[PDB]
Amino acid sequence: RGYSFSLTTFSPSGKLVQIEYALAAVAGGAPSVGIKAANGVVLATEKKQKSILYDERSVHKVEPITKHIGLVYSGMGPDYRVLVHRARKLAQQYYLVYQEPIPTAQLVQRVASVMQEYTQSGGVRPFGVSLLICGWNEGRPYLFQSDPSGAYFAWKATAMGKNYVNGKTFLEKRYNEDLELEDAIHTAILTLKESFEGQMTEDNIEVGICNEAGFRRLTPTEVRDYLAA
């Protein structure tokens, strides 16, 4: 009926190697990038299909949670789907009780609590995925990041997946605090371009934005114009 003992334990040096190994799994996903601007945030991913047979339209990596929140991932997709489903349920319960849209910080706290529960229960492994949350509430844009352990942060510009070290090393230089959302998109795209090993196309990447009006992922017809420059 299920195991009752933990699978994550302490080591003679105080480490949790199951969590370290879930992080090593995350370090082998596809690159992700987030950049917070003066009036919005931007999420940009590498959606590179294995071969031409795969129908690109069917599966997406940038998903909404409410009318003002959306997130991307790096790591394992089947785990990402479970997390997305539970986040949607969490937001609906909050709205049911308070008749108000949930704030991004409360959303991130509840999601990280679930991810932490999966480090100390019986007979389970930790999730192999880190998240990048986006939001806008009370006239301010937010951008958080959640780890496989259950620890969340807050950034101005970050990068996940493969080549994240060089990603943030390059991201630090250009970043300005006065940056507009439309000029931030160029930097997000350029950062992805540094490590792509190929040729950019309207179906190689996904891009989502969030401003005053809500969350939405750009359409390939718009990604085309943005890639033209």
């Binding site: 195991y3 009752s4 003992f5 933990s6 699978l7 994550t8 334990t9 302490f10 080591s11 003679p12 040096s13 105080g14 480490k15 910080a105 706290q109 990280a112 609590s113 932490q116 480090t119 100390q120 229960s121 019986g122 937010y142 951008l143 352990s149 259950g150 620890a151 942060f153 807050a154 950034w155 101005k156 510009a157 970050t158 943030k168 991201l171 630090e172 970043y175």
Partner: protein, 247 residues
């Protein structure tokens, strides 16, 4: 199945508890935190561990967590477990207030939490929380207090303690500069700054590698106020001046 069990809650051939011994060594490498008690209030002073430029300081603090109208704490170890513990402490305080219509005392709060920490070491098969806490507060009976818990589940009242990294040398130098009964809040701040300045391997403090909170009673009300960067900078300047003057 028995093959995969790891037996987190058993004795060792010498009477030890290995999982707790290992969680203590986990807590050994965290960021330095220190507390000091005085005549007119208590103070906490932690160390900022994440100093990356691209971060955001949206929160009013990083390791403070006001638990009630009269108390507050600080953690060392694993943030993910710290969040669970802080939620539990808030719930305990509100249940007490609902039953008696008075605020809870600090020793009762610390006790009710250490019971939960202890029940994770005797049965269940789980692993224990890798977190140490410090508390500060004020109540009707004993006034300003300062406690400390550990993963095993035993606490104790103090007057000037320290957990985290290099806490051994921190307490060693605390023993020689603390004088019972005569310390005021300002001399407390001075000693705290001058202890943090040494027990951190960096050349000198930065007023953003630190984080300082106090607690006082004013007009029959408790005030818990996190100090500001300018105030901290002024304190550091004062420390720099007097130390330089002596030699």
């Amino acid at each position: 199945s028995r093959r995969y069990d790891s037996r987190t809650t058993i004795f060792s051939p010498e009477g030890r508890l290995y999982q707790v011994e290992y969680a203590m060594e986990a807590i050994g490498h965290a960021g330095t935190c220190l507390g000091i008690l005085a005549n007119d209030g208590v103070l906490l002073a932690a160390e900022r561990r994440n100093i990356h430029k691209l971060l955001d300081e949206v929160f009013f603090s990083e390791k403070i967590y006001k638990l009630n109208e009269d108390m507050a704490c600080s953690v060392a170890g694993i943030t993910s477990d710290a969040n669970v513990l802080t939620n539990e402490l808030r719930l305990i305080a509100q249940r007490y207030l609902l039953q008696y219509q008075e605020p809870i005392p600090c020793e009762q709060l610390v006790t009710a939490l250490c019971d939960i920490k202890q029940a994770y070491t005797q049965f269940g098969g789980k692993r224990p929380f890798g977190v140490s806490l410090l508390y500060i507060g004020w109540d009707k009976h004993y006034g300003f207090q300062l406690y400390q818990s550990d993963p095993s589940g035993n606490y104790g009242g103090w007057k000037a303690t320290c957990i985290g990294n290099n806490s051994a040398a921190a307490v060693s130098m605390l023993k020689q500069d603390y004088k019972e009964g005569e310390m005021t809040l300002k001399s407390a701040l001075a000693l705290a700054v001058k202890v943090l300045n040494k027990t951190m391997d960096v050349s000198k403090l930065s007023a953003e590698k630190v984080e300082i909170a106090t607690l006082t009673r004013e007009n029959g009300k408790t005030v818990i106020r996190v100090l500001k960067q300018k105030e901290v900078e002024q304190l550091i300047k004062k420390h720099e001046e007097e130390e330089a003057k002596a030699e």
